[PDB]
Amino acid sequence: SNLIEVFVDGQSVMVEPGTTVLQACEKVGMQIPRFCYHERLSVAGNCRMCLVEIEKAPKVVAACAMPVMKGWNILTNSEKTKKAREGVMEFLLANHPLDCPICDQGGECDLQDQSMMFGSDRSRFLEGKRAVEDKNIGPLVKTIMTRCIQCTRCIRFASEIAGVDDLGTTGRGNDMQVGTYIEKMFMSELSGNIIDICPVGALTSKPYAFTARPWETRKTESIDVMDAVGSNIVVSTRTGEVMRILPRMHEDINEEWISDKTR
Amino acid sequence: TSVKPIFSRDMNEAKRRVRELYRAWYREVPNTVHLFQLDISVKQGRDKVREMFKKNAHITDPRVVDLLVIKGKMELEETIKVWKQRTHVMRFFHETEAPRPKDFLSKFYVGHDP
Amino acid sequence: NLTLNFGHGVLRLVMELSGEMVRKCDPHIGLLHRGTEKLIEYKTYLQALPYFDRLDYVSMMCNEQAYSLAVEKLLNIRPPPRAQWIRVLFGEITRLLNHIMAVTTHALDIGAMTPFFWMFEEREKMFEFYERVSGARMHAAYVRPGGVHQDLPLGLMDDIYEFSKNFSLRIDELEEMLTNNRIWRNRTVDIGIVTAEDALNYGFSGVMLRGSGIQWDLRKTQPYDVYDQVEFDVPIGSRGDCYDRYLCRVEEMRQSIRIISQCLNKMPPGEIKVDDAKVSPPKRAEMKTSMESLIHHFKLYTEGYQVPPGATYTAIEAPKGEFGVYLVSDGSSRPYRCKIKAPGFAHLAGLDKMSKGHMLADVVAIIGTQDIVFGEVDR
Amino acid sequence: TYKYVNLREPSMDMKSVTDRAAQTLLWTELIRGLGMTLSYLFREPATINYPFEKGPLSPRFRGEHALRRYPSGEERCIACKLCEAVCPAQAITIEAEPRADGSRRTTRYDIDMTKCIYCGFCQEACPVDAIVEGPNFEFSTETHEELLYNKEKLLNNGDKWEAEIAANIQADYLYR
Amino acid sequence: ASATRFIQWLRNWASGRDLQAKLQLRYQEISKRTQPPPKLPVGPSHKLSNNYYCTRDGRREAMPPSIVMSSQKKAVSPAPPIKRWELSQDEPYL
Amino acid sequence: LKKTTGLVGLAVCETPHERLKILYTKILDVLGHIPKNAAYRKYTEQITNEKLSMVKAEPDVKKLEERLQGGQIEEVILQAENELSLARKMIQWKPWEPLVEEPPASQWKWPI
Amino acid sequence: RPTVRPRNDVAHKQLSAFGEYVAEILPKYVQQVQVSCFNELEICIHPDGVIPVLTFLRDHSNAQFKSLADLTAVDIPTRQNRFEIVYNLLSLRFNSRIRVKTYTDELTPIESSVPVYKAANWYEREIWDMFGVFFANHPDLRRILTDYGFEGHPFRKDFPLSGYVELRYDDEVKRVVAEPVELAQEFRKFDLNSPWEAFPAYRQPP
Amino acid sequence: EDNKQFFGRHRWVIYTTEMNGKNTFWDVDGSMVPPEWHRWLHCMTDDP
Amino acid sequence: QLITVDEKLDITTITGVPEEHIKTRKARIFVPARNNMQSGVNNTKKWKMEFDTRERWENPLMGWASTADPLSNLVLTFSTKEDAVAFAEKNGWSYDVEERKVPKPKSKSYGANFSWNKRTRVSTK
Amino acid sequence: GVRTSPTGEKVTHTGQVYDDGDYRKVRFVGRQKEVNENFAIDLIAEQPVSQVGSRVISCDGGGGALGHPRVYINLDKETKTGTCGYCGLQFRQQ
Ligand SMILES: CCCCCCCCCCCCCCCCCC(=O)OC[C@H](COP(=O)(O)OCCN)OC(=O)CCCCCCCCCCCCCCCCC
Ligand code: SF4
Ligand code: SF4
Ligand code: SF4
Ligand code: SF4
Ligand code: FES
Ligand SMILES: [K+]
Numbered sequence A: 001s002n003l004i005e006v007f008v009d010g011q012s013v014m015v016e017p018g019t020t021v022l023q024a025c026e027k028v029g030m031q032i033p034r035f036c037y038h039e040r041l042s043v044a045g046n047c048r049m050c051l052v053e054i055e056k057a058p059k060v061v062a063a064c065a066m067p068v069m070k071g072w073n074i075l076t077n078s079e080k081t082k083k084a085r086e087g088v089m090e091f092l093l094a095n096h097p098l099d100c101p102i103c104d105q106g107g108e109c110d111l112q113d114q115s116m117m118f119g120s121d122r123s124r125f126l127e128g129k130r131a132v133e134d135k136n137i138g139p140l141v142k143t144i145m146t147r148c149i150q151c152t153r154c155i156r157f158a159s160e161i162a163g164v165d166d167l168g169t170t171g172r173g174n175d176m177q178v179g180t181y182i183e184k185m186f187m188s189e190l191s192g193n194i195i196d197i198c199p200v201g202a203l204t205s206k207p208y209a210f211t212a213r214p215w216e217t218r219k220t221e222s223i224d225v226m227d228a229v230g231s232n233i234v235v236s237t238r239t240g241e242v243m244r245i246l247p248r249m250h251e252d253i254n255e256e257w258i259s260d261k262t263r
Numbered sequence B: 001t002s003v004k005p006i007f008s009r010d011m012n013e014a015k016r017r018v019r020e021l022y023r024a025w026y027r028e029v030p031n032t033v034h035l036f037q038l039d040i041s042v043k044q045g046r047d048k049v050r051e052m053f054k055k056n057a058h059i060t061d062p063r064v065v066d067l068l069v070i071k072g073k074m075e076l077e078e079t080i081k082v083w084k085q086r087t088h089v090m091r092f093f094h095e096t097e098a099p100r101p102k103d104f105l106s107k108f109y110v111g112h113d114p
Numbered sequence C: 001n002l003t004l005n006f007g008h009g010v011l012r013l014v015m016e017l018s019g020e021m022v023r024k025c026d027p028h029i030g031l032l033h034r035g036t037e038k039l040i041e042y043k044t045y046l047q048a049l050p051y052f053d054r055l056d057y058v059s060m061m062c063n064e065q066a067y068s069l070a071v072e073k074l075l076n077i078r079p080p081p082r083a084q085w086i087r088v089l090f091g092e093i094t095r096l097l098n099h100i101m102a103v104t105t106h107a108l109d110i111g112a113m114t115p116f117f118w119m120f121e122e123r124e125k126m127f128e129f130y131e132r133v134s135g136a137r138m139h140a141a142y143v144r145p146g147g148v149h150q151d152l153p154l155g156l157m158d159d160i161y162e163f164s165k166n167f168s169l170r171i172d173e174l175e176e177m178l179t180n181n182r183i184w185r186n187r188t189v190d191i192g193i194v195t196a197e198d199a200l201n202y203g204f205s206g207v208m209l210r211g212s213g214i215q216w217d218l219r220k221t222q223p224y225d226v227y228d229q230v231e232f233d234v235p236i237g238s239r240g241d242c243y244d245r246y247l248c249r250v251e252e253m254r255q256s257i258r259i260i261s262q263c264l265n266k267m268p269p270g271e272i273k274v275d276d277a278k279v280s281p282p283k284r285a286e287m288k289t290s291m292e293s294l295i296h297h298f299k300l301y302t303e304g305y306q307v308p309p310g311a312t313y314t315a316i317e318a319p320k321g322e323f324g325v326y327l328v329s330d331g332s333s334r335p336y337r338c339k340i341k342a343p344g345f346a347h348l349a350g351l352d353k354m355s356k357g358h359m360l361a362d363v364v365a366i367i368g369t370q371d372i373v374f375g376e377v378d379r
Numbered sequence D: 001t002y003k004y005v006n007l008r009e010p011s012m013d014m015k016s017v018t019d020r021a022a023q024t025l026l027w028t029e030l031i032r033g034l035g036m037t038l039s040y041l042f043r044e045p046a047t048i049n050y051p052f053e054k055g056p057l058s059p060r061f062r063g064e065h066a067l068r069r070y071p072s073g074e075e076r077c078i079a080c081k082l083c084e085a086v087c088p089a090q091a092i093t094i095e096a097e098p099r100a101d102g103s104r105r106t107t108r109y110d111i112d113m114t115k116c117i118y119c120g121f122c123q124e125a126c127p128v129d130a131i132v133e134g135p136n137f138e139f140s141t142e143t144h145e146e147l148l149y150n151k152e153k154l155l156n157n158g159d160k161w162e163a164e165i166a167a168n169i170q171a172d173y174l175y176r
Numbered sequence E: 001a002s003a004t005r006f007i008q009w010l011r012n013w014a015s016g017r018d019l020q021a022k023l024q025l026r027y028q029e030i031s032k033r034t035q036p037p038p039k040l041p042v043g044p045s046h047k048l049s050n051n052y053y054c055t056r057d058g059r060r061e062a063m064p065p066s067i068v069m070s071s072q073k074k075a076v077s078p079a080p081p082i083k084r085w086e087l088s089q090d091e092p093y094l
Numbered sequence F: 001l002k003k004t005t006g007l008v009g010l011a012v013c014e015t016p017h018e019r020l021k022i023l024y025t026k027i028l029d030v031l032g033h034i035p036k037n038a039a040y041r042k043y044t045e046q047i048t049n050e051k052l053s054m055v056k057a058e059p060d061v062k063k064l065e066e067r068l069q070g071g072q073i074e075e076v077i078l079q080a081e082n083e084l085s086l087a088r089k090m091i092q093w094k095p096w097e098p099l100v101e102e103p104p105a106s107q108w109k110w111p112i
Numbered sequence G: 001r002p003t004v005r006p007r008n009d010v011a012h013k014q015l016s017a018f019g020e021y022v023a024e025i026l027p028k029y030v031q032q033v034q035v036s037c038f039n040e041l042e043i044c045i046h047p048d049g050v051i052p053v054l055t056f057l058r059d060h061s062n063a064q065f066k067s068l069a070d071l072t073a074v075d076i077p078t079r080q081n082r083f084e085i086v087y088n089l090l091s092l093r094f095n096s097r098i099r100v101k102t103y104t105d106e107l108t109p110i111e112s113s114v115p116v117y118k119a120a121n122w123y124e125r126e127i128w129d130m131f132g133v134f135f136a137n138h139p140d141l142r143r144i145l146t147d148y149g150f151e152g153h154p155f156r157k158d159f160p161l162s163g164y165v166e167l168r169y170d171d172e173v174k175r176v177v178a179e180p181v182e183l184a185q186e187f188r189k190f191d192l193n194s195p196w197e198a199f200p201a202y203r204q205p206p
Numbered sequence H: 001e002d003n004k005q006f007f008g009r010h011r012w013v014i015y016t017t018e019m020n021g022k023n024t025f026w027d028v029d030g031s032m033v034p035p036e037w038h039r040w041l042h043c044m045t046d047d048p
Numbered sequence I: 001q002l003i004t005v006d007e008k009l010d011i012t013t014i015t016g017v018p019e020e021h022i023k024t025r026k027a028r029i030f031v032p033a034r035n036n037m038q039s040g041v042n043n044t045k046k047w048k049m050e051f052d053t054r055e056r057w058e059n060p061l062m063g064w065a066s067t068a069d070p071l072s073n074l075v076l077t078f079s080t081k082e083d084a085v086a087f088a089e090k091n092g093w094s095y096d097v098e099e100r101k102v103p104k105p106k107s108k109s110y111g112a113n114f115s116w117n118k119r120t121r122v123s124t125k
Numbered sequence J: 001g002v003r004t005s006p007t008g009e010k011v012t013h014t015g016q017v018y019d020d021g022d023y024r025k026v027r028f029v030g031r032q033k034e035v036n037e038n039f040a041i042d043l044i045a046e047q048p049v050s051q052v053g054s055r056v057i058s059c060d061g062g063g064g065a066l067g068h069p070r071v072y073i074n075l076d077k078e079t080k081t082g083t084c085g086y087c088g089l090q091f092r093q094q
């Protein structure tokens, strides 16, 4: 009775009111590209990678934030949508550093992969790039902030999940920088999760630095024993050696987080 | 449960082909030991034939039995026609393999495997 | 009936003889089976390419071309015109390489050892063309889905012209030794006769078909790359025997020089791999300056390009006959299944049929007329 | 378009028949074959005087591997593992950690030269021209183990051959 | 190219060919082993505008097979009959 | 009369017109034992009747070969023999009957 | 468009029409007919139809697929009938190719097509050797590629890449012997698939 | 060098009789050519 | 003609697997967890079957990881868990099946970022 | 920067050395431990810091397309120098 009918590329789907355009696409197995959106954080709407055409509407909408209206037809593969994705990816990569060989995110990078699937195959950026100084936030999270794409996921996670309001943005415009402003360490029992949610290699694990590449790791699904919560984990190994520990999603236990001791 | 047969329509029909194969293998061992100049006795060769047949005694699907006979006849053809060499015949006997530990304590001492 | 257990690679022949006559030929192969098809399933599409050099390892770049065409077909992309001309140019150089090996080792096996030496000095010069474009004399890994790896170095086309200018005289010297030699004709004329209808039903291809009068050549009937833009004649036999098939191969070498000449004259300018960096890696200078180019380089050399799901049978006129692949994509960057159709596989399966009513020494001539390399037979 | 290799009718006039009789009895075509091999006897042979003379190669030649340096002496390799990922033979094994100065560098870099197919994919994949196939092809050994190269061997190859390797890269990098 | 005139005459007569015109050994006619650097052209996608990847994306134009019949008028052949090949005018007979 | 068909093992036919009339007539007789609504009968009678009419309407062999487009007239005869052999096999196979069995649900689904 | 493979609608239409033609003539056996976007026609049939369908395509005047280009199998473990048998045929008369596919499991024989194409002889031996599919009424079915006495069917998806045994010369018994496989360097498994969908056109319904 | 010789015989090296403490009067080796001359002797370049 | 066969499908005697790698193995049937480092969900669509991990040791010569487990790299893909279970059953492997974990649907509201009186109000953007 | 352990074995630039009780050093008996003597960590340290006038500098490692991918280095921090992540060259804003 409550449900309303919307269409994803002509395919009817029934959704509760308040469902976003992006969520309506999930229902038919279509994953809209995203950077700033994380389903466990508050909606931001700033990366613009999720722009999608609504049939008969002249303006693309941010699928992650726009509530779907009755009778809307979401064109997830139209020319307008594809050009919107190409344009955004082009801006994201304009100042991004040519770091993939030396960057630990390489091989499991959402920027790399969505560039491969939704971006152009070349550059027309002829200028010099931005370079940003690095911030020390403790012995666990290395920062290479020239890689940061300003998605604000780390800021929202810290404020909402960790309950620590130490991360923010300073400056304005192209010089907007994520950090603590002052010299401050982000030491929280949940701090290491910002490594996972950072879509790029801007935030990386210090202990893990340089030791492995994602494709070569074997994944063993296991359980944490550092406490009695029973957090579900993945143990990455290579050639018989434990390389790192990652969260494994379990809605009823740890969701997709783990503590710094577990990590 | 209605399937296409291979050769036999039931276990009694299949068990006939097993017996015919066993006789063929039984009578071939003496010539095999001579032709390949094997150092095993004829009794060892037949004891090996019987052992190979006995590990499949629990099969009750006629189609599986048919394939085992089909494969057993290919193995016999390879032997009678000397397509096999001496190494291939003696591979049944695992002469260079040291005896693996079977009881729990022995397995525990040497490694982690069950 | 005496049984002989033994009588390119290594082959085990089990023969039944009634005096001088062969009553049964049972080739036992697999002595060079290396599970290539299974290995390819653990490789990206690029990582699998060098396996094709090592099949018919006399016709390396033609095997590469067949695989590249198959992948290009599933990718739904098109290699650029200059790449197509290079591929035809080196396809025909490769045919010369193969036919020299086929004809002179066929001659060497039945006692005529000297043309092998004269023509292998010509092979040595074509190995230099391989090495100059690719850095390897044999397993070039040069032809790839999307085009070729590198453009020709300056000065190569001039040296190919110099080689081609003189080659037909070298064929003439080979023909003076064999074509009219009564001993050579005694060993090949009316040997291994195969009828047009039998050849088709036994799955023969290439010269094994045309020697028997069948007018079939994939370069003419189902052309690929720029073969529709070059002129040449398909040699056709009349008696379906070893001697006619020898004549077809010799004449095919002459037509290869004819094609090579047109390729040199018609070579166009431009890029040599598809201008699509989601398939073909960017130029090194771009990879070192542009963010998109570096990402695409990183991904093409680690994950590789994803191929849309589907299956294709793609075939070419290789020097030994129809060479094809049945390539199945599951949508990922690794092939799900790659069946390699080798022309020599069906030809060797027909050895027993072809050798009926012949003598032992003729079995050597028949295996030679079939042009058998066990890299592609066993895979 | 097609042509017949062997579809001709011998002329059955007396002159032609007698010509074929003369060939049969006087072995004329066999003698004509003797002339060809006689003419080769008096040609200069194609042999070169190895090892004093060498077969020509090109700058693209794929030979023994080497790990290269920057002009300062710092290693080019930054342990990205692209070469290891692309290697069709899985001949490359790499381990890395932060160096004592924080640099991203390898602690293991092995090439099993008996797994390697000398394909050159590693040097195509490398983003910093660190791993190359050099010009050397005369490195056969007496034992299998000597062909299992570790990082020290490969760095030594680079220092040994860099003079030639750099010049060859200089000649070919505009085709890459 | 170093043979005396008598030996040149002898091997030409024995072979029946003018061998000196087409020597199988290479001398100065081969290209220099050092060449000027190339300057290679760029492909058609090397443009600063009107070049969106979605208009030149071959892989994404691939479609699943068209199902013409699923178990869920004149006769035809798979294609027109092949045309007869024509005899070569360059050299119909060897 | 040509001297060779050009295909090894395919002898020249002295009387191609009579041979084809006999073969095509034989085919239409065998086809009469197939049910009238079987597609194999309707389609094969259609093509056979077209070829038979061409044979009667053209006495010159080389001009008949051009009309039929089956290669040499000796090839056309061989194809007629193949069709006649096939027609007799279809009578025992009866492929016009309904599908023997549907496949499992995902039998032809790809990718999985 | 320089980088995009051109479509060929004329060939797509011709192949589609012939696909319906075959389906109308052998409804007893034809389960599915499809033409790919690169214009390859596939006929999917019940395994009982192997001999009738191949004979029809070889002998019928509007088919004349006289040449068997290839015959092979594909292993798909998730299917109840895991083995897909693929026949690739060539018609010189009509300069055309067709692909015929059927299916079988580990215990169901497939009729040998040697009566239709003598070329099938060794291809079927290879399928038996590499996949373990038994062909009924084969003149001589036995291994063709693997070592004598080799156990298993290596091309099955669940057969390990390096197998179960390996060979070496043993001096004590003065012969080559087979022993369980131990690798000095284990083959390194790579997880390469991107977690982002590449091809929307092939998305499966959820 | 002698450029009147055919390509391949136009360049050659007479190895030293002693290298790195080894008597090489009879025992010469292709690996004795140092890299800077290796490029020239193999015709990888034109200039020595 | 067809026959009736009521026995459970079992092919362990005709697959050629050594006895050790049938009875002593434990197949795990599962849908791989999403790699937490990426948001893409395309590697969580299919069911997988892997085997229990066994010993890897250092090669004395080079230090490479050696193994004696022939199944160490074997990983099969299945449309459904029924297909995977069916495959495991007929091959004689004992197995564990883990139920697919699907992210539960969330309630998202951009407007909540600016709540007049609730804690969902964000202090920064 | 090669140093020898108490037992005499040279230590590699990765710090590897067989300890006193390791049998594996028997492989060097009658042969040698191959060690490269040009330690890159030492060689890069000898390079002088480069003084620049801007807040941001770029490095491609030298040689244009023969170097490494071009990266931009921020020089705002005055405590330390800017270091190239590819080649290790150091920069400082004057
Ligand atoms: C007025 C009254 C007059 C009365 C007297 C008249 C007699 C003279 C007129 C007749 C001339 C007789 C010639 C005799 C020579 C022998 C001829 C001969 O036997 O040749 C035939 C033989 C087989 O020929 P074939 O083509 O295979 O088939 C024919 C049968 N089906 O073919 C062969 O033998 C081929 C030989 C094979 C060996 C090849 C290797 C040798 C090639 C180089 C030979 C060099 C010459 C030898 C010189 C020796 C010097 C000491
Ligand atoms: S964050 Fe991603 S795109 Fe950026 S350098 Fe690292 S791997 Fe490359
Ligand atoms: S550091 Fe990472 S998570 Fe934080 S804003 Fe930048 S890109 Fe987003
Ligand atoms: S040349 Fe090829 S096989 Fe050898 S290490 Fe490099 S990538 Fe691997
Ligand atoms: S050699 Fe090159 S590709 Fe290989 S790890 Fe080092 S930097 Fe990366
Ligand atoms: S994901 Fe929607 S704007 Fe960032
Ligand atoms: K990260």
Ligand SMILES: [Zn+2]
Binding pocket: J059, J060, J061, J068, J084, J085, J086, J087, J088, J089
């Ligand atoms: Zn630098």
